[PDB]
Amino acid sequence: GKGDRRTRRGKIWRGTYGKYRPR
Amino acid sequence: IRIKLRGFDHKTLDASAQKIVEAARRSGAQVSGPIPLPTRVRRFTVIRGPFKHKDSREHFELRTHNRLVDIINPNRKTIEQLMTLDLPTGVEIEIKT
Amino acid sequence: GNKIHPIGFRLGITRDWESRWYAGKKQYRHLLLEDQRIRGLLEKELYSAGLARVDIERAADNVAVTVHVAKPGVVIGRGGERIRVLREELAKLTGKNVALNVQEVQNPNLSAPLVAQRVAEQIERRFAVRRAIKQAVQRVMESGAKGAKVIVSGRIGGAEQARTEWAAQGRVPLHTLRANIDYGFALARTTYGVLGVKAYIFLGEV
Amino acid sequence: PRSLKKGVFVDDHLLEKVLELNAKGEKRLIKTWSRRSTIVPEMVGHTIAVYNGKQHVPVYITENMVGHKLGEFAPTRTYRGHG
Amino acid sequence: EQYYGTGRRKEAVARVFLRPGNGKVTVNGQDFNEYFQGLVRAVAALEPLRAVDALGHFDAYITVRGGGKSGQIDAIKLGIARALVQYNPDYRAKLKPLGFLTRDARVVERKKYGKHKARRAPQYSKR
Amino acid sequence: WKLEGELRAEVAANIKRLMDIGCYRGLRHRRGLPVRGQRTRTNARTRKGPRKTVAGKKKAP
Amino acid sequence: ARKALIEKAKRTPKFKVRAYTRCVRCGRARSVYRFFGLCRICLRELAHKGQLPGVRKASW
RNA sequence: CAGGCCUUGACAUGCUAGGGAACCCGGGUGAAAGCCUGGGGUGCCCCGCGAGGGGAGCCCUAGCACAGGUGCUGCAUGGCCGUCGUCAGCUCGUGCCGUGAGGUGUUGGGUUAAGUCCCGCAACGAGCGCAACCCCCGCCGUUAGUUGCCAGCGGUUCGGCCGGGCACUCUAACGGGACUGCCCGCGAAAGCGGGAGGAAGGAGGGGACGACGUCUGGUCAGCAUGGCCCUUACGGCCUGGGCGACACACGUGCUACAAUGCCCACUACAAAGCGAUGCCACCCGGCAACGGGGAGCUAAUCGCAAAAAGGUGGGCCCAGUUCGGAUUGGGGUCUGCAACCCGACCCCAUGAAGCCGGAAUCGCUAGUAAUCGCGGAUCAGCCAUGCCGCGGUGAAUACG
Numbered sequence A: 001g002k003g004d005r006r007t008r009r010g011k012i013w014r015g016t017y018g019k020y021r022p023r
Numbered sequence B: 001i002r003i004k005l006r007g008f009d010h011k012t013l014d015a016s017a018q019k020i021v022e023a024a025r026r027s028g029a030q031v032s033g034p035i036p037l038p039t040r041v042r043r044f045t046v047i048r049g050p051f052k053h054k055d056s057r058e059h060f061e062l063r064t065h066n067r068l069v070d071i072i073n074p075n076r077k078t079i080e081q082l083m084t085l086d087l088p089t090g091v092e093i094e095i096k097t
Numbered sequence C: 001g002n003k004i005h006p007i008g009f010r011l012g013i014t015r016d017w018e019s020r021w022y023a024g025k026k027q028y029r030h031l032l033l034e035d036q037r038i039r040g041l042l043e044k045e046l047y048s049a050g051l052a053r054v055d056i057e058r059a060a061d062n063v064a065v066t067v068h069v070a071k072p073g074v075v076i077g078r079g080g081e082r083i084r085v086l087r088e089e090l091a092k093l094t095g096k097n098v099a100l101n102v103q104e105v106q107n108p109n110l111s112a113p114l115v116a117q118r119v120a121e122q123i124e125r126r127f128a129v130r131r132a133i134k135q136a137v138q139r140v141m142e143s144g145a146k147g148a149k150v151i152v153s154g155r156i157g158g159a160e161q162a163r164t165e166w167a168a169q170g171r172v173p174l175h176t177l178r179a180n181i182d183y184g185f186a187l188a189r190t191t192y193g194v195l196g197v198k199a200y201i202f203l204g205e206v
Numbered sequence D: 001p002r003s004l005k006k007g008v009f010v011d012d013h014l015l016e017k018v019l020e021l022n023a024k025g026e027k028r029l030i031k032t033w034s035r036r037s038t039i040v041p042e043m044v045g046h047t048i049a050v051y052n053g054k055q056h057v058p059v060y061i062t063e064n065m066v067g068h069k070l071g072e073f074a075p076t077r078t079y080r081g082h083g
Numbered sequence E: 001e002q003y004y005g006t007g008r009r010k011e012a013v014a015r016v017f018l019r020p021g022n023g024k025v026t027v028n029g030q031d032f033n034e035y036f037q038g039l040v041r042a043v044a045a046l047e048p049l050r051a052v053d054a055l056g057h058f059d060a061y062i063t064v065r066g067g068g069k070s071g072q073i074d075a076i077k078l079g080i081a082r083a084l085v086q087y088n089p090d091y092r093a094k095l096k097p098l099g100f101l102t103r104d105a106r107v108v109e110r111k112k113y114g115k116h117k118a119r120r121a122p123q124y125s126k127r
Numbered sequence F: 001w002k003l004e005g006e007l008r009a010e011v012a013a014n015i016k017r018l019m020d021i022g023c024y025r026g027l028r029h030r031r032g033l034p035v036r037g038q039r040t041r042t043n044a045r046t047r048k049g050p051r052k053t054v055a056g057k058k059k060a061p
Numbered sequence G: 001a002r003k004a005l006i007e008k009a010k011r012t013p014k015f016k017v018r019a020y021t022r023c024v025r026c027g028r029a030r031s032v033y034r035f036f037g038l039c040r041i042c043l044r045e046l047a048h049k050g051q052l053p054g055v056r057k058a059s060w
Numbered sequence H: 001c002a003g004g005c006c007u008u009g010a011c012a013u014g015c016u017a018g019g020g021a022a023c024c025c026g027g028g029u030g031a032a033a034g035c036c037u038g039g040g041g042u043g044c045c046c047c048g049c050g051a052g053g054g055g056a057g058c059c060c061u062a063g064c065a066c067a068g069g070u071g072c073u074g075c076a077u078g079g080c081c082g083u084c085g086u087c088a089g090c091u092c093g094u095g096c097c098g099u100g101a102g103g104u105g106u107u108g109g110g111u112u113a114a115g116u117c118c119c120g121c122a123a124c125g126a127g128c129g130c131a132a133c134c135c136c137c138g139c140c141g142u143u144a145g146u147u148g149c150c151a152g153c154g155g156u157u158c159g160g161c162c163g164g165g166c167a168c169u170c171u172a173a174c175g176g177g178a179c180u181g182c183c184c185g186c187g188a189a190a191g192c193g194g195g196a197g198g199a200a201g202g203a204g205g206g207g208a209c210g211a212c213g214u215c216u217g218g219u220c221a222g223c224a225u226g227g228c229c230c231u232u233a234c235g236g237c238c239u240g241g242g243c244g245a246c247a248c249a250c251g252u253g254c255u256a257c258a259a260u261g262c263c264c265a266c267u268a269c270a271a272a273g274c275g276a277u278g279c280c281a282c283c284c285g286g287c288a289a290c291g292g293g294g295a296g297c298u299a300a301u302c303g304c305a306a307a308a309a310g311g312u313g314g315g316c317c318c319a320g321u322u323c324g325g326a327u328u329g330g331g332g333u334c335u336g337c338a339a340c341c342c343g344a345c346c347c348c349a350u351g352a353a354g355c356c357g358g359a360a361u362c363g364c365u366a367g368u369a370a371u372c373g374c375g376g377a378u379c380a381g382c383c384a385u386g387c388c389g390c391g392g393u394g395a396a397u398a399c400g
């Protein structure tokens, strides 16, 4: 879910990037 | 020979687009007529009252219109007669090669 | 309290700005603060001259303050000495080549900002507030205005229970955009508090 | 935490206070307001008075509390529960 | 050799070019069915030449930008409806009653202050 | 990596360490309140547990 | 505590992280816009007067 | 709030006296503020081969006049705002009625979103309102053609990239367009039902706009302002704390409880905005936050930028789970003088409640609700899941 930061969905929510949502 | 015109009022911005193009059309020849670029709107949204009445606002904006002007063949009979031009107060001219 | 400022409402349709110039984001505020510092000085000094509107134009390190006024001879003074007593004190806070101009107002009783200052001074001089309004609305109508409306809010006659009083003649369409309604507010300070004076002058539709 | 590209933070004025004591055969009671100054090995064995906003609480510093800040040991709010 | 129309709907503009052909349709370089793949509302974009049995009498070279996939579908549906009647005016009747030649102007009503959306209001609580 | 029991013992050892020295985090783990800056006036229920409803102040009739 | 806070705000601080905008007109600290030097209230008073170049009551 | 400090004071105009300075670089102590200090070197018009003596921006020490107060009173007030209510209303001038308050007009018949309009009438007009004039959206035209666009011939490293063109799309200014103007029907009329043309039809959709007044409504803490009040303190500077507390209770929201879902990979389609100790292409280091390089852009050109849901392919198989992401341990990153109280982000691990919610209760009538993401203001950073905007996909229902 959007609250799960360790996912490509939660990173979109916080507007941030990481291993779980790279660019 | 390129001129770009900025100004808050578009009526002064637009009137000064003919009063420039038609000058370089008096000292010919080739001119590229007044093209308008997209406007840049700076929006301000303010609580209407001085205190606590949060769900009532009033909108404001500052419109910075933009026009482009190109003179193809210089011919210094304008490089003198454009320096001798009478453009209104609220407008910025900026001239590029 | 609900009604919108008749000038801000008509800005672009019937009222031009009192300051006209362009300035990219990097120095709008600086020219704006300067604009305010000027108006502060002139509204103080040129109060007894009958100040009605300060126009401030600006282009390239120079500024053209244009003062519309009831008694221009007061502003200029002796042959242009009191005029230049300001033309330089202005430029002492302007730094720029601060050109000053003086304009004659065709009718003072047709200038809403002055009517309000007149009535505001009449209460400071303890005149009858009810009478002092009906008198002013009378002069504006005799001067050809298509309608006028004047309003006093506060401790009229020093009454503990503050109050609002007004009078209006002709017509004052505040909802019409093509109506030219001059508007002017003045503040009247007395010993028992402060009083608000609002003036609406319907000049005509265009 | 503080980016270790930068140093470990001690307000310097507090750090002088402790290195003089070591040199002169410590220890005096050290009263500081730098609740932020990181506990640093040159402090163990001393006792620092930490201002929690009202008082200077004594704090005896031991080896097992080094990576911490001084404010951690002078709490700022007194509680005691609700009636 | 060419009969064009302009089709507009919801922040989406569409240039459609009707030309003689077998039936092949293209939209921005890709094939029609490759650009609206699986978007089951695709077929509706070609209903104008189903109201006049030219369903294979043309090839359409179409350009779209702005809006979304569906906003570009009715953008087409109006444009090809326009390019068609621009190929012959008699097509107007039987195309006007199908609502084809008309641009529906349903746009996103703006957000308004004191609200969560255009009209969705903050939840009322009387205490 | 260290797992099941040892990981719990090393997690327990660090909480225990924070409680022993008396640092602010140590008082949080004692009284059972949150540790990472969260406010407690309202929720904190995961850390506080079921609500303990008390009586409140009264109005006037 | 107000006028001495109009003053302390103008001054250059001990650390650049200690600087805050104040309304140049009324001295208010909150809701001051960078573009104008004005708070959200003076922004509305000068706007309606027409003493704000090129700003116009928006509507769309 | 605590403690350490200042006393014509952080700030204003004025008067003196002593210095006689202006300003810039330090130093001792101290948490800092502060207190104590140390350097050099002021023109102004002057008498000048002299001592220089004066005077003057501005400085500084003592002395005053005075400053200062977010102290109190919104039940003394201006200004601004909320509200009833974008509800259809509130009144005036003359005449008429009534001893008078007051009535008439403004009521009545019909019609409208409307005191909108029509007919009637001891009334006849008028004003503030309603409408309209104004802004955005919807169709067409003119004018323009770069930084925007590429219809058709030429190239083309296959990028509108080059020639070239402005047709189109767009961009932005001025115009056209709809008025019950037309037909059928009703009606005394205003109007109402339907039709045709038409992008749009009955006020096209949305905005801005809020009558006389109400609520002794709200704000002396935005500002202004009367009065009352404090004056080595109710003023001022600092450092630290507090505004973030937590047996509890309520409001507004975010995230969910799963399969119309979740997950990974591949792949499409927006709009409005912002961007010179700014936005950052691309490059290497790093699992990542980021870091180092490093072009372009004073921006229809360069950048934020990936839009997301979606489309395709594959994995999970009904589990407190590959649902959910709280809580907690450890390790970092970054802004900042400084992240203990009290920042945001990233990575390993931890993986709570929650199985659709009692009594009760909210919003929405259409590109609306619902859902998806995107931007801006404030801003060093950020507790934004808030607000103001933006488009994407797109219903259900109204008997009454």
Ligand SMILES: [Mg+2]
Residues within 6 Å of the ligand: A001, A004, A007
């Ligand atoms: Mg998951």
Ligand SMILES: [Mg+2]
Residues within 6 Å of the ligand: B054, B055, E122
């Ligand atoms: Mg709200």
Ligand SMILES: [Mg+2]
Residues within 6 Å of the ligand: C191
């Ligand atoms: Mg008195």
Ligand SMILES: [Mg+2]
Residues within 6 Å of the ligand: none
């Ligand atoms: Mg558009």
Ligand SMILES: [Mg+2]
Residues within 6 Å of the ligand: E108
């Ligand atoms: Mg939407």
Ligand SMILES: [Mg+2]
Residues within 6 Å of the ligand: F037, F038, F039, F040, H244
């Ligand atoms: Mg807390």
Ligand SMILES: [Mg+2]
Residues within 6 Å of the ligand: G002, G003
């Ligand atoms: Mg003040």
Ligand SMILES: [Mg+2]
Residues within 6 Å of the ligand: G017, G018, G019, G020
């Ligand atoms: Mg700050």
Ligand SMILES: [Mg+2]
Residues within 6 Å of the ligand: G020, G021, G022, G029, G030, G031, G032
């Ligand atoms: Mg601020």
Ligand SMILES: [Mg+2]
Residues within 6 Å of the ligand: none
């Ligand atoms: Mg009280």
Ligand SMILES: [Mg+2]
Residues within 6 Å of the ligand: H074
């Ligand atoms: Mg009041």
Ligand SMILES: [Mg+2]
Residues within 6 Å of the ligand: none
């Ligand atoms: Mg009031």
Ligand SMILES: [Mg+2]
Residues within 6 Å of the ligand: none
């Ligand atoms: Mg109160």
Ligand SMILES: [Mg+2]
Residues within 6 Å of the ligand: none
């Ligand atoms: Mg009524």
Ligand SMILES: [Mg+2]
Residues within 6 Å of the ligand: none
């Ligand atoms: Mg009468």
Ligand SMILES: [Mg+2]
Residues within 6 Å of the ligand: H098
């Ligand atoms: Mg009777």
